[PDB]
Design an enzyme around this catalytic site. Structure first.
Site, PDB file in Angstrom:
ATOM      1  N   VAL A   1       0.807  -1.231   0.000  1.00 23.39           N
ATOM      2  CA  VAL A   1       0.000   0.000   0.000  1.00 23.39           C
ATOM      3  C   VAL A   1       0.840   1.280   0.000  1.00 23.39           C
ATOM      4  CG1 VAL A   1      -2.009   1.260   0.948  1.00 23.39           C
ATOM      5  CG2 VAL A   1      -2.000  -1.267   0.933  1.00 23.39           C
ATOM      6  N   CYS A   2       1.967   1.296   0.756  1.00 23.45           N
ATOM      7  CA  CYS A   2       2.837   2.482   0.788  1.00 23.45           C
ATOM      8  C   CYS A   2       3.479   2.696  -0.547  1.00 23.45           C
ATOM      9  CB  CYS A   2       3.870   2.389   1.906  1.00 23.45           C
ATOM     10  SG  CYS A   2       3.131   2.145   3.547  1.00 23.45           S
ATOM     11  N   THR A   3       3.890   1.617  -1.245  1.00 25.82           N
ATOM     12  CA  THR A   3       4.486   1.761  -2.575  1.00 25.82           C
ATOM     13  C   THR A   3       3.418   2.338  -3.518  1.00 25.82           C
ATOM     14  OG1 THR A   3       5.917  -0.096  -2.034  1.00 25.82           O
ATOM     15  CG2 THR A   3       5.886   0.593  -4.341  1.00 25.82           C
TER      16      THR A   3
END
Lengths: 161, 160
Positions: free
Chosen positions: A46-48
């Protein structure tokens, strides 16, 4: 210890991915709003996705001439590799010692057995230091409303004229 | 805290895929375990003359022993590091700094970053005995991987 809307954003100094100190107030002295993007973990799915979506909308953010500062508790070395791999054209700041997440009250006591990780959150701070937008999720799988973040940052820029 | 010849304290940490890895389950397989502590994935290493980002932990694959590499980085960062360096062993995340306190291998502060792992090597026999210990206060100082492989192959050889 709560960063409310219209309240002054607490100042901080954090090393970026190249170990350079970045101070929020010095950034705000430039005259453009600051977009603070907190994220739980470099190289996580999700952060990527989140940082790559902001990258793909950089041209729309640079219209508002806004300063983007992405923050996680990862080391600057991990953050440097993450910035390079994704071609992120903004500073990633390390809150390794958990000072900034405690200050902005955006932390998970426990995430997947990992203690004191940043919550996914977005704050837009005006050049005068007032918090103009605050988005904080207790579920890190949720993504911010990107188009609205960009729209609100552009609205601040236009109001500055 | 952890001396040569004494029993290595047990621990469980998540690996790069969030699978818990327990030291004593590993030892139970019947081969020595090589514990390698390191300050940070993707950080540099220096000799008196050469400073690089080339990590040489992959040389430990040669050892007739199970290899466990430990840093305080998240399992997501360790998964990227494992994949980039094509490391054929587990990388464990001591994110909560419990293992570095237990083995007394930590830097109070490194470049403003608090509670980071010292570069260290422990070779633990299947019975739990610490048969080799190397610690440095220099976060840049990489162990001599050829000497570690040498001691590990020797420790695994003595095994009766």
């Amino acid at each position: 210890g709560l960063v409310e809307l219209g309240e002054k954003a607490p100042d901080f100094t954090l090393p970026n991915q190249d170990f350079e100190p970045v101070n929020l107030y010095e950034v705000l002295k430039r005259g453009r709003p600051a977009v603070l993007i907190f994220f739980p973990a470099a190289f996580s799915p999700v952060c990527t996705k989140e940082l790559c979506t902001f990258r793909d909308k950089m041209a729309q953010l640079e219209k508002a001439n806004a300063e983007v500062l992405a923050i996680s508790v990862d080391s600057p070395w991990c953050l440097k590799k993450f910035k390079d791999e994704n071609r992120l054209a903004f500073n990633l700041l390390s809150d390794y010692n958990r000072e900034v997440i405690k200050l902005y009250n955006v932390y998970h006591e426990d995430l997947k057995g990992l203690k004191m990780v940043a919550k996914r959150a977005v704050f837009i701070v005006k050049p005068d230091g007032t918090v103009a937008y605050k988005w904080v999720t207790d579920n890190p799988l949720n993504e911010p409303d990107y188009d609205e973040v960009v729209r609100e940052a552009n609205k601040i820029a236009g109001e500055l004229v």
